[PDB]
Design a protein around this nucleic acid. Structure first.
Ligand SMILES: [Mg+2]
Ligand SMILES: [Mg+2]
Ligand SMILES: [Mg+2]
Ligand SMILES: [Mg+2]
Ligand SMILES: [Mg+2]
Ligand SMILES: [Mg+2]
Ligand SMILES: [Mg+2]
Ligand SMILES: [Mg+2]
Ligand SMILES: [Mg+2]
Ligand SMILES: [Mg+2]
Ligand SMILES: [Mg+2]
Ligand SMILES: [Mg+2]
Ligand SMILES: [Mg+2]
Ligand SMILES: [Mg+2]
Ligand SMILES: [Mg+2]
Ligand SMILES: [Mg+2]
Ligand SMILES: [Mg+2]
Ligand SMILES: [Mg+2]
Ligand SMILES: [Mg+2]
Ligand SMILES: [Mg+2]
Ligand SMILES: [Mg+2]
Ligand SMILES: [Mg+2]
Ligand SMILES: [Mg+2]
Ligand SMILES: [Mg+2]
Ligand SMILES: [Mg+2]
Ligand SMILES: [Mg+2]
Ligand SMILES: [Mg+2]
Ligand SMILES: [Mg+2]
Ligand SMILES: [Mg+2]
Ligand SMILES: [Mg+2]
Ligand SMILES: [Mg+2]
Ligand SMILES: [Mg+2]
Ligand SMILES: [Mg+2]
Ligand SMILES: [Mg+2]
Ligand SMILES: [Mg+2]
Ligand SMILES: [Mg+2]
Ligand SMILES: [Mg+2]
Ligand SMILES: [Mg+2]
Ligand SMILES: [Mg+2]
Ligand SMILES: [Mg+2]
Ligand SMILES: [Mg+2]
Ligand SMILES: [Mg+2]
Ligand SMILES: [Mg+2]
Ligand SMILES: [Mg+2]
Ligand SMILES: [Mg+2]
Ligand SMILES: [Mg+2]
Ligand SMILES: [Mg+2]
Ligand SMILES: [Mg+2]
Ligand SMILES: [Mg+2]
Ligand SMILES: [Mg+2]
Ligand SMILES: [Mg+2]
Ligand SMILES: [Mg+2]
Ligand SMILES: [Mg+2]
Ligand SMILES: [Mg+2]
Ligand SMILES: [Mg+2]
Ligand SMILES: [Mg+2]
Ligand SMILES: [Mg+2]
Ligand SMILES: [Mg+2]
Ligand SMILES: [Mg+2]
Ligand SMILES: [Mg+2]
Ligand SMILES: [Mg+2]
Ligand SMILES: [Mg+2]
Lengths: 122, 134
RNA sequence: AAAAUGUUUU
RNA sequence: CCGUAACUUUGGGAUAAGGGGGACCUGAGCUGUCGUGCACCCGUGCGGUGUGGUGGCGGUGAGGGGCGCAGAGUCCAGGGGG
RNA sequence: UUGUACACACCGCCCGUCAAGUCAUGAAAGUUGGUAACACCCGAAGCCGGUGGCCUAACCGUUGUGGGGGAGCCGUCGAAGGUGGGACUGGUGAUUAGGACUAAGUCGUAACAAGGUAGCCGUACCGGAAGGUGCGGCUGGAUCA
RNA sequence: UAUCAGCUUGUUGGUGGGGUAGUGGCUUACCAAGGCUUUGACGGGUAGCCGGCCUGAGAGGGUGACCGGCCACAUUGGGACUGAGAUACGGCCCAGACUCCUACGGGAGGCAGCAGUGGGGAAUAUUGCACAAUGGGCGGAAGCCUGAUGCAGCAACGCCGCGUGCGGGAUGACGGCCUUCGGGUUGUAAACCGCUUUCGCCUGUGACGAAGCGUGAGUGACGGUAAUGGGUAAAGAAGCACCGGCUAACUACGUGCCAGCAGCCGCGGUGAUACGUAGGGUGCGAGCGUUGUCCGGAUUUAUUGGGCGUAAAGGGCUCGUAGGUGGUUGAUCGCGUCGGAAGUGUAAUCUUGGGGCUUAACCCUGAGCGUGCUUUCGAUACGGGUUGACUUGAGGAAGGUAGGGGAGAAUGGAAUUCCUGGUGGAGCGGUGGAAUGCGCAGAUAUCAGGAGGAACACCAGUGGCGAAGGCGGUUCUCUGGGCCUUUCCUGACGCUGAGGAGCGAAAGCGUGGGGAGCGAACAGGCUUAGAUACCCUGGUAGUCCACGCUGUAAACGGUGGGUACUAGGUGUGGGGUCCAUUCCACGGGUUCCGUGCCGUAGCUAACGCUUUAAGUACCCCGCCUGGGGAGUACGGCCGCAAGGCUA
């Protein structure tokens, strides 16, 4: 565009889409497990991915993935929910922080323990 | 209609130099004559001449004769217009532009007449950055 | 001269 | 006197709805009209005309004030909206 | 050699209804809130403007008081509240609409080759659905030169 | 933010008065009708602003913690009082909401001061010490007050520094792990030998901050603190992430599209370097990862620094308003622009030179920076203002001139259909093949006469005209634009153009007319698994006319307008002018304006474009920012409706 066109109407940037609206500017949010279940992934994958409908303290209810082999949380279990997308799962944009509040660390972890909330074993 | 006769001079020179023409001609103006003079003094054209009208009998004609070196080699690597009519560019005595790392010359119209950057910097005078001929 | 279709391997 | 919706065929809907003031005493100026009278055009002897008159009558009144439970004080005289 | 949206290579690719599920969203008799004001009614404190018959040590007195002040009272303004009609906006809503994704469901084969009626654009009507047809246009078609 | 277009009536101005520290519609009376706004008023949304902070090559983008400056507020709303000074935090008055006391009559209160509690939250500390230092209030002073401040506690929250050992040690030991059963690897690692003592722990010494303060005596909260001597033992002191690619670092075992992993590409379906564990390794290290957020990479809003023929992107076309922009030249102004000077840009930060903490972080100090602004003095090349010329851009005059440019009216012929009559008789028609259909009530065919509507063969394309959409019988009437020309005239009057307005194929809509042919819908016949189609026979709106409406097209050259420049070659349309023979014209040239094809330089991702640019440049406008959702919803405008526009 001409300089006069830029003067009359300047450049405008893009919108910069948000990824995790339910957190509302917080690194993680507390919630209650309104439902605990399993979901079949999208193709080409195939499994029984463990997820939970959680009512976060922001008043929004979202689906959160439960990582790691092992699971204890059930109905009305208080959880901490952080960001994180599961690619082969449409509509899952949050994960549950293992080792925090009611959810507990994965039992037999010995590598990458901190990411699954497993205390070091003597 | 014609908007920037200086840009017309620059593009005429660029096109003629690219097409390997020995001479180019244009309607004459004082600032065009000054730019041609400093181009000749800096060695980018062989010579220049202002001709009294005898074909159109209307106005003076400025004619630039260019120089090509051994094996038909361009003496002008390019010319660019800086202070456009749409947006004019003025440079201070400290912020004078450098062309081709200093190899080329920026033509600056200062309050003391047309002066190449090197000159201006020596006189510590700025002005309107007309061209970047290199 | 008209004359349709071709699931999910691993 | 202020103000008034959905909708609309742009006319409406509408007095939509919903408000304020009103009478009495006093009253500054403003006006309708006539007026003896001033000068004047006078075609006068015209059954006239334009300036112009302190005043009379009437209309209207800002403001100020009085009294009562109540000032459209009686009779008369839409309820409204979806 | 030409065309192609095919390259799993025409036993290709691919379109839309219908049926099922999931998610987000629109409409909707209504219903439930919120915000910002408006026009009136009433109007505390208070300042200001009046008034003050009541109360008043300094001042002045013709030494019976007066001056000045104060309580009180009235008026304007005035927060809040009341009443009414609008404006904007959030949630929700029987019912309903299309969108996205998922069976490897059903119905045809519309497009891609001249896709077997060349395709597409605007518009119009028609039809379970793709689509069909008319009118004008385009080549992002071609036959025959 | 325009999916907010009108806002304001003490409102804008005037005069007199009042008021105030003070100007002022600040207030009041009177007079006038202003004031603001598409260069965005009014309304909605969000927000304390800045020095700075983060990021970035820079330009920018994000941000407003500590610290420092200004502002605003102190339970919510309002009000004044006192005072030099008041949003009066720890004041007063009233009202509202709250909490508390009450003998029920009435009273009391406001941590967004410091610490602290409840609550909310992913999340943020002690109900500490001292006025010794600096600052403040009052007092003549000693002094008193100071949750300012100086300090300490708490938290890896950040930054910085240090330690967890150092040298030697092959016999390359065991043990794990791997293996080709040879061995390899962990690994100089260990064992073993000799050393050192920072930090921690134990113990001793022990400050500065005070050139203060106090008449003196005396006087340090921090504080037995920092620093430092001695002692102990190599000890009390290493984890976290990762190892398919980007990306530094690989194998075995287990599992078998399961369990699971993932930032993207993807991995897992029996040989998984991608899951889980182990050995080994790599990056970091009192941290390491994950999540959130910001900038970068992203030239992915491109001023620096992008684009629009086919990738997303040229408005359907023109006219034209604001605006942007401006051929040659004289004079002048000195606003832009440029150069000095003065003032200012506090400090801190930041860059940098010195200095101090054992170094560093940090701290002090000098300078720079503070990218500007104001004042003032100069310069006049350019931009602009004022003013005067010039004619080449532009327009006009006169003459020449091409054409389906447009509107109106009359009118010509062929053909179709229908009608009437003659003739004649069995089919006609139609298709891939048929049938529906028509026809002995005489069709088809054939001839004559007539009626009517619509479109104009040949000319006619490789062409002309128009802003585009578009425009073809002939004639007349009315009318627009273009092209050329040497003289002539005006003298930059130019270009573009948001919003706005007009024009805008066909279909469609309204009223009336017309209706031959054609022909959506429709009916029937065929084809077919079906055939709401293709094909056939019928056939209504429509196609036509008048006047409106709609305003969209693959409205395409998918290429906005203007201008200048940059090889040619070769067709063709229009106007001149020149030449020879003519004294026509055939011909050649040449010039100006169109319209094609080929093609160089150049450009492009390629295809291709290439003087009619998609090349080289300047001016202005429109537009693009991944694909869908979607040119859809909501709102608004336009329309009779269909719908269109904005989005
Ligand atoms: Mg009414
Ligand atoms: Mg009424
Ligand atoms: Mg009265
Ligand atoms: Mg009454
Ligand atoms: Mg009556
Ligand atoms: Mg493919
Ligand atoms: Mg809704
Ligand atoms: Mg009142
Ligand atoms: Mg008073
Ligand atoms: Mg008195
Ligand atoms: Mg009162
Ligand atoms: Mg109120
Ligand atoms: Mg519902
Ligand atoms: Mg098909
Ligand atoms: Mg087809
Ligand atoms: Mg049909
Ligand atoms: Mg005054
Ligand atoms: Mg705020
Ligand atoms: Mg800011
Ligand atoms: Mg501060
Ligand atoms: Mg005072
Ligand atoms: Mg106070
Ligand atoms: Mg204070
Ligand atoms: Mg307090
Ligand atoms: Mg506190
Ligand atoms: Mg909590
Ligand atoms: Mg002191
Ligand atoms: Mg003292
Ligand atoms: Mg005290
Ligand atoms: Mg590698
Ligand atoms: Mg395996
Ligand atoms: Mg950028
Ligand atoms: Mg980014
Ligand atoms: Mg781009
Ligand atoms: Mg362009
Ligand atoms: Mg495109
Ligand atoms: Mg166009
Ligand atoms: Mg348009
Ligand atoms: Mg203009
Ligand atoms: Mg100029
Ligand atoms: Mg000059
Ligand atoms: Mg400094
Ligand atoms: Mg040092
Ligand atoms: Mg500074
Ligand atoms: Mg000028
Ligand atoms: Mg003429
Ligand atoms: Mg007509
Ligand atoms: Mg023909
Ligand atoms: Mg042609
Ligand atoms: Mg002249
Ligand atoms: Mg328009
Ligand atoms: Mg039509
Ligand atoms: Mg019609
Ligand atoms: Mg009709
Ligand atoms: Mg038919
Ligand atoms: Mg067209
Ligand atoms: Mg287009
Ligand atoms: Mg344009
Ligand atoms: Mg152009
Ligand atoms: Mg040409
Ligand atoms: Mg291009
Ligand atoms: Mg629409």
């Amino acid at each position: 565009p001409t300089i006069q066109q830029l003067v009359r109407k300047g450049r405008t940037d893009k919108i910069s889409k948000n990824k995790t609206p339910a957190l509302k500017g917080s690194p993680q949010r507390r919630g209650v497990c309104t439902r605990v279940y399993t979901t079949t992934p999208k193709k080409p994958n195939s499994a029984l991915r463990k997820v939970a409908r959680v009512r976060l303290s922001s008043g929004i209810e979202v689906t959160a993935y439960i990582p790691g082999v092992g699971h204890n949380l059930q109905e009305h279990s208080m959880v901490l929910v952080r960001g994180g997308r599961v690619k082969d799962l449409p509509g899952v944009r949050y994960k549950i922080v293992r080792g925090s509040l009611d959810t507990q660390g994965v039992k037999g972890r010995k590598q990458a323990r901190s990411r699954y909330g497993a205390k070091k074993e003597k | 209609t014609m908007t920037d006769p200086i840009a017309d001079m620059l593009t005429r020179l660029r096109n003629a130099n690219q097409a390997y023409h020995d001479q180019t001609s244009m309607p004459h103006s004082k600032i065009k004559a000054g730019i041609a003079g400093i181009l000749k003094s800096e060695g980018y054209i062989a010579d220049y001449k202002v001709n009294e009208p005898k074909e159109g009998e209307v106005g003076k004609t400025l004619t630039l004769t260019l120089k090509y070196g051994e094996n038909r080699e361009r003496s002008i690597a390019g010319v660019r217009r800086i202070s456009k009519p749409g947006l004019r560019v003025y440079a201070k005595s400290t912020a004078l532009p450098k062309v081709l790392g200093g190899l080329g010359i920026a033509i600056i119209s200062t309050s003391q007449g047309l002066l190449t950057d090197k000159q201006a910097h020596e006189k510590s005078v700025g002005g309107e950055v007309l061209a970047y001929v290199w």
